Write a protein that binds this DNA or RNA. Structure first.
Ligand SMILES: Nc1ncnc2c1ncn2[C@@H]1O[C@H](COP(=O)(O)CP(=O)(O)OP(=O)(O)O)[C@@H](O)[C@H]1O
Lengths: 985, 212, 200
DNA sequence: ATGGTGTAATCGCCAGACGACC
RNA sequence: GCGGCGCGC
DNA sequence: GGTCGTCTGGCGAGCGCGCCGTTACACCAT
């Protein structure tokens, strides 16, 4: 019903409202109202927009003229039009008789004053002005009172929101004024989107040539800035002259930002352009997205939202501050909502043709407005080149090679980050909505989605309000954790990085250390084999050099950000994926990363070790070493005691000693643990030592653990440590042993396949296949996993391994079928249900037991569902919802006991003094999650959702036959997990 | 040495007597999605200059019947001329990732050498020739590094400059100049490279080989 | 016959055919065979002088070679080209596969002498593996040689070789150790086309 | 250091379309 | 958005 | 056009993060 040009005109009028250019929009409106063929494009929304602009301005005569134009058009006035009229009457006071007559005329149409006051997108100021007008006319009218916020009454979430229970909520270690100045720093950092960070690469001494190159760059950039300003001014003049005649143009969109900001953004885009260029459409899209983002950020400082946010943040900081006390302690989101609530608004994006036209106009301005001397008349820097990219021909903006040469010479030691990819300098805002949230000024999204995927954020906005309060609060709590840089680890990492790095530990090497092709003495034409091997060696050396360069670039970015964040306290905000799993917003430096990233990060707040802190630190160290993975905790502690000399030597002399920590699986975290233990053991009181180190408790395999819990399998639970035992039970060792038992039976047939493989059965062969059963691995992928491991080892045949691989896949699958039977029954039921739902023509949708709705996005190219992806993704996706539910429950019940809890999926991290309490919360909520019927609730929800259509009654019955056959439960009680010492360990 | 330059410029060997005595040519530049052509007289006048943009080609399969039908439809609109100039790309068999384009460029040319070269069975003399794009770019100073750049500005100077100036390169007839300017102004947001390369190749052929 | 014949064609026009040319091309040689409705071979020939696949692709040289080859061929109502069945994903087959398409493309343009006016296709392509499955020369997923089949055919036979059959026998005995398969494949392709398409 | 240049060769199961009939 | 790699669960 | 037995091409472990680059190589020339 909406044409493209209609969207262009509506966006034009909205942008004129935002830029305060009402006479120009009025001129375009009247010139389109003059011609009769143009009036078919005009819509009541445009008239309401111009009316709202005139009402905000305060011009009554033009408003009456717009009413006359609407009456001449013949459209019916809308309630928002009457709201704008009342706003104009309020702003410009007049006799009450005319306003009363307007209200009477509105009442004759059947409109309701309550419908005018609420459910309208008008701001609070407009509502106040309309209320003043009504109070002038009728003082008896008043708004209904605001109800108290609802409390979630879910069975699993009852203890979190119970007022009668005793609570000890944690508090930060920083005073109020420090938090206020950190808020000021974060606001000033987010106002200017770019952030400049000093590189960690070893600098080069400044010669005369590099100084000359830098001076030429500075002079060229000054001329380019002035030329861009003149070009933008003349473009604005000609576009305004175009709008004066009856034609649409992009003048308000160019008036959206200040001239200097646009020139600075264009210069940044020119600087960021690579040597080999990028596609013109990509640059247009980035320019449009950047100018929209800058408009969104910079509008708030003009509208005055920044000062209101400042005052409300200052009031809200008393809850987190150590020296401030609230009257009644409560959760951060409830305290934020209890005070004045800054009304964050969902922003409507512009139409795609407008965005593309603006981007192309700005890119053309950049191309035409920049010139340089060749070094001699002036020549442009950027050119259009038609080149092949991917498998298609495309246009590319390519810079002049002189520009690239001057950029390569005198390399700038600075790097540019966005304000959203750096950690927050102030505590994040609480999560109060799917759109409002962590960042102060930048727009936010709760669920990470691909471009064009709006179903995830539309299903999240139609749920009952209480349903997400379990998740959002957890997402707030994970955001409230305060991080810091370790410092001592960073010095060693930088020392290895700036010199020739060690790739064994995880520090990439410089391109100088990359290998080179061997020297050639024989002619290439002498033998085809010689030139062929030289070409292959060169093509391998180039590839490994490119890989090394990419790895070094990633390490450089991460270490530069870490160096920027040194000696400062920062917060990592969190969001979710489409299934409920939590990820940090900053991508580069976070705790969901490699060894180096996890070893640089420490807790800002510290807690005393207590009676049992040092033992947990030692067990964590032994866990990180990996030498004792199949041993009980007491023997782990004994091993920690007997190896204390190596720990002390590694802590004192990390790089000039016996270097024991390098032998561990995670050397950097091991070194951090050795340092932390060394300080604690050498303290006067070991209990009184304050530790910032995170201690990690993990589970073996949440897929098989949760499948066993759903099926209550007696023999599966023993394998996955859901039944108490003194010694931990490994799934991989058991399946390997069963496979070795099957090979002994083969003596009957005496097959050659069996006897070559008899010696080489190992845990390593089956580990990958057993950890990937959860993701629905097929026999072919299991073969592609086993065959590689057979290839590295020196098996007796070394050929026809294809025959050996198939038998091993069959026997590992039979062993995993006898070990796990209810598990495969549930996976088969889920796969069949997903297939039958996808064949009917819908995507699988389910509600997480904490109330989060999840919809599976896979579709074909109003599209049709992808039956294969929807069928093969449901059993892996369902388990991940269960894991996130248990993690969020553990977080929400650990917060009530004053615990610092952070999660890297399947792994729960807390202070060394607070591990044992967390373990109880880890187990008591596993029994409470699985005490409630998960499978039958899922079956009933799926029946109600996907079998309510009157059409296709036969297919509905066929679907209901499968959906109402849940696998029968077993005979292992779920209340004995609470006595299992190795459930999470 | 001059013959060496013409051998580097032109793929099929053509004697100078026939090149010097031409009367009218058609320059053709094709791409994945579009083809363009221009017809020029000995006294350089653009009698027609046309674009085709809607194709079923380069969508999945490589079926030669569809190629034959589309090429016949394009050639049916083309008038007759002495020589038909075609663009030669720098793609080689070494670049495997760009092979699907190259296959396309080798099919159409194979048909354009076959369908356009009428009376080759009787006469035995070539009438379709291929010209390198890099040489044309070097002639028009459109080469930056090893990448040839667009020539939209040069064509705009050719078309919208109504002043006589001194020795114009190309003459546009007064009857067809309005439609030419309309076609130029219509395709400004979406750049159609072949429409420019056809005219540039026509001028380059009429200067480097003819009127040398 | 969508799966057997690549271009769409009416069955009524398929039934009323007099004689067909069957053409098979390789890297080094071209072979063809002229065979009529009565399953009697009128012509069977291959050429040795090729002058292509020398590392430099040139459409003018291809045009000259195909013109010289076509000038020898007699007129018929249908020209049956083979389909090689290679895939575009295999990189190592790139230098050969391109050649086939080029040789296919001109063979559609040069042989459709009236396509500009009527708009009807006189040249068709038929799938190779269907022919192999019909003649049971398919072992696994690869077709075997057809020297035994053509020796059995020529030495109620399917093919009725004519006065001129002695020359065909002399050609068959002429250096049969040379790696010539196109000459056999053209004849068996023509026989398969006459069996599957116009018969029954 | 930079920068231009003249050259090519072995599984095995599932979901959507094909031909005859209507 | 298409190729080569690396990381976490 | 609608449908059924089949068969034939195709994809074969789920999420989420990154870097880098879009005919290549010895010669030439300097
Ligand atoms: N749940 C999971 N799903 C998929 N891949 C996983 C995974 N957990 C770990 N991996 C991957 O598998 C690799 C090896 O796992 P490991 O490092 O051996 C820990 P593990 O799987 O618990 O074996 P373990 O029990 O001997 O410690 C990891 O580096 C990671 O890339």
């Amino acid at each position: 019903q909406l044409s493209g040009q209609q969207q262009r005109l509506l966006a034009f009028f909205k942008c004129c409202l935002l830029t305060d250019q009402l006479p120009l929009a009025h001129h375009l409106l009247v010139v389109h109202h003059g011609q009769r063929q143009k009036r078919k494009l005009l819509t009541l929304d445009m008239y309401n927009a111009v009316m709202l602009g005139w009402a905000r301005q305060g011009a009554f005569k033009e408003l009456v003229y717009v009413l006359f134009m609407v009456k001449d058009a013949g459209l019916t006035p809308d309630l928002l039009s009457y709201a704008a009229a009342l706003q104009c009457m309020g702003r410009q006071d007049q006799d009450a008789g005319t306003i009363e007559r307007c209200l009477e005329q509105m009442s004759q149409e059947g409109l309701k004053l309550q419908a005018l006051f609420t459910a309208v997108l008008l701001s609070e100021e407009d509502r106040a002005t309309v209320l003043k007008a009504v109070h002038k006319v009728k003082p008896t009218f008043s708004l209904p009172p605001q109800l108290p916020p609802p409390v979630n009454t879910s069975k699993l979430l009852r203890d979190v929101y119970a007022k009668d229970g005793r609570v000890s909520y944690p508090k930060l270690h920083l005073p109020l004024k420090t938090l206020q100045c950190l808020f000021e720093k974060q606001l000033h950092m987010e106002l200017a989107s770019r952030v400049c960070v000093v590189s960690v690469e070893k600098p080069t001494l400044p010669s005369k040539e590099v100084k000359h190159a830098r001076k030429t760059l500075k002079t060229l950039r000054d001329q380019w800035e002035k030329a861009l300003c003149r070009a933008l001014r003349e473009t604005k003049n000609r576009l305004e002259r175009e709008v004066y005649e009856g034609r649409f143009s992009l003048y308000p969109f160019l008036c959206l930002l200040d001239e200097r900001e646009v020139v600075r953004m264009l210069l940044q885009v020119l600087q960021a352009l690579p040597a080999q260029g990028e596609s013109f459409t990509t640059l247009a899209r980035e320019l449009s997205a950047r100018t929209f983002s800058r408009h969104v950020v910079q509008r708030q400082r003009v509208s005055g939202q920044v000062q209101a946010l400042q005052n409300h943040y200052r009031k809200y900081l008393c809850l987190l501050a150590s020296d401030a006390e609230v009257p009644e302690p409560c959760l951060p989101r409830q305290y934020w909502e209890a005070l004045g609530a800054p009304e964050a608004l969902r922003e409507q994006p512009w139409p795609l043709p407008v965005q593309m036209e603006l981007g192309k106009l700005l890119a053309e301005m950049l191309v035409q407005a920049t010139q340089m001397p060749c070094s001699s008349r002036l020549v442009p820097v950027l050119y259009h080149v038609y080149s092949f990219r991917n498998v298609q021909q495309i246009g590319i903006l390519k810079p002049h090679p002189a520009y690239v040469q001057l950029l390569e010479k005198a390399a700038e030691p600075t790097l540019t980050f966005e304000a959203v990819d750096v950690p927050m300098l102030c505590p994040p805002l609480p999560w109060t909505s799917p759109h409002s949230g962590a960042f102060l000024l930048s727009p936010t999204k709760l669920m990470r989605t691909v471009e064009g995927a709006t179903q995830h954020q539309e299903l999240l906005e139609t749920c009952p309000p209480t349903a997400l309060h379990g998740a959002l609060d957890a997402l707030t709590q994970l955001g409230n954790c305060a991080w810091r840089v370790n410092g001592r680890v960073l010095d060693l990492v930088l020392q290895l990085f700036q010199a020739k790095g060690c790739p064994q530990l995880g520090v990439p090497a410089p391109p100088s250390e990359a290998p080179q092709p061997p020297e050639a003495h024989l002619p290439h034409s002498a033998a085809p084999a010689r030139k062929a091997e030289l070409r292959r060696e060169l093509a391998h050396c180039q590839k490994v050099a490119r890989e090394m360069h990419s790895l070094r670039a990633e390490a450089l970015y991460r270490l530069s950000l870490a160096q920027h964040l040194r000696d400062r306290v920062f917060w990592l905000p969190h969001n979710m994926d489409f299934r409920g799993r939590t990820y940090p917003c900053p991508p580069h430096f976070n705790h969901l990363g490699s060894d180096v990233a996890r070893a640089l990060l420490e807790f800002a707040q510290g807690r005393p070790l207590g009676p049992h802190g040092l033992d947990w630190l030692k067990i964590h160290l032994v866990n990180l070493t990996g030498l004792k993975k199949r041993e009980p905790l007491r023997k782990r502690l004994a091993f920690a005691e007997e190896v204390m000399d190596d720990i002390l030597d590694s802590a004192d002399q990390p790089l000039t000693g016996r270097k024991w920590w390098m032998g561990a699986e995670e050397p950097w975290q091991t070194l951090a643990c050795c340092m932390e233990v060394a300080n604690a053991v050498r303290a006067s009181d070991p209990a009184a030592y304050v530790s910032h180190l995170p201690v990690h408790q993990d589970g073996s395999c949440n897929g098989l653990q949760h499948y066993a819990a759903l099926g209550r399998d007696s023999v599966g639970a023993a394998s996955v440590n859901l039944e108490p035992s003194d010694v931990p039970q490994d799934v991989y060792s058991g399946v390997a042993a069963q496979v070795e038992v099957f090979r002994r039976q083969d003596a009957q047939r005496g097959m050659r396949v069996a006897q070559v493989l008899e010696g080489f059965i190992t845990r390593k062969v089956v580990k990958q296949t057993v950890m990937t059963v959860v993701y629905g691995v097929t026999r072919y992928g299991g073969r592609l996993q086993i065959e590689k491991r057979l290839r590295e080892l020196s098996d007796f045949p070394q050929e026809f391994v294809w025959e050996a691989s198939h038998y091993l896949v069959r026997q590992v699958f039979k062993s995993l079928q006898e070990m796990f039977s209810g598990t495969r029954a549930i996976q088969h039921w889920l796969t069949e249900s997903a297939r039958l739902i996808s064949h009917m023509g819908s995507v699988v949708e389910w509600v997480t037991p904490l109330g989060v709705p999840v919809i599976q996005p896979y579709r074909l190219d109003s599209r049709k569902p992808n039956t294969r992806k929807q069928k093969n993704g449901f059993p892996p996706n369902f388990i991940h919802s269960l894991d996130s539910s248990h993690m969020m429950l553990t977080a929400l019940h650990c917060y009530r006991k004053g615990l610092t809890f952070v999660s890297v999926h399947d792994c729960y991290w807390t202070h060394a003094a607070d591990v044992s309490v967390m373990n109880q919360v880890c187990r008591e909520q596993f029994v409470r999650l699985h005490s409630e019927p998960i499978l039958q609730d899922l079956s009933r929800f799926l029946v109600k959702r996907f079998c309510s259509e009157p059409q296709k009654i036969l297919e509905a019955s066929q679907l209901k036959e499968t959906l109402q056959a849940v696998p029968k439960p077993g005979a292992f009680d779920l209340e004995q997990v609470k006595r299992s010492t190795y459930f999470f360990s | 040495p001059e013959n060496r330059f013409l051998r580097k410029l032109l793929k099929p060997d053509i004697e100078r007597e026939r090149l010097k005595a031409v009367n009218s040519i058609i320059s053709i530049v094709f791409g994945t999605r579009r083809i363009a052509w221009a017809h020029l007289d000995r006294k350089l006048t653009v009698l027609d200059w046309q674009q085709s943009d809607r194709w079923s080609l380069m969508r999945g399969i490589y079926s030669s019947s569809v190629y034959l039908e589309e090429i016949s439809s394009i050639i049916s609109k083309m008038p007759k001329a002495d020589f038909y100039v075609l663009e030669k790309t720098g793609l080689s068999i070494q670049n495997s990732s760009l092979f699907p384009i190259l296959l396309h460029f080798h099919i159409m040319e194979a048909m354009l050498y076959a369908l356009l070269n009428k009376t080759f069975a009787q006469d035995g003399q070539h009438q379709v020739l291929s010209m390198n794009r890099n040489a044309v770019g070097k002639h028009f100073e459109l080469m930056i590094g090893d990448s040839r750049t667009s020539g939209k500005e040069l064509v705009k100077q050719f078309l919208f400059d109504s002043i006589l100036k001194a020795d114009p390169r190309v003459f546009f007839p007064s009857d067809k100049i309005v439609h030419y300017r309309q076609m130029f102004l219509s395709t400004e947001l979406q750049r159609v490279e072949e429409l420019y390369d056809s005219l540039l190749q026509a001028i380059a052929f009429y200067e480097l080989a003819v009127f040398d």
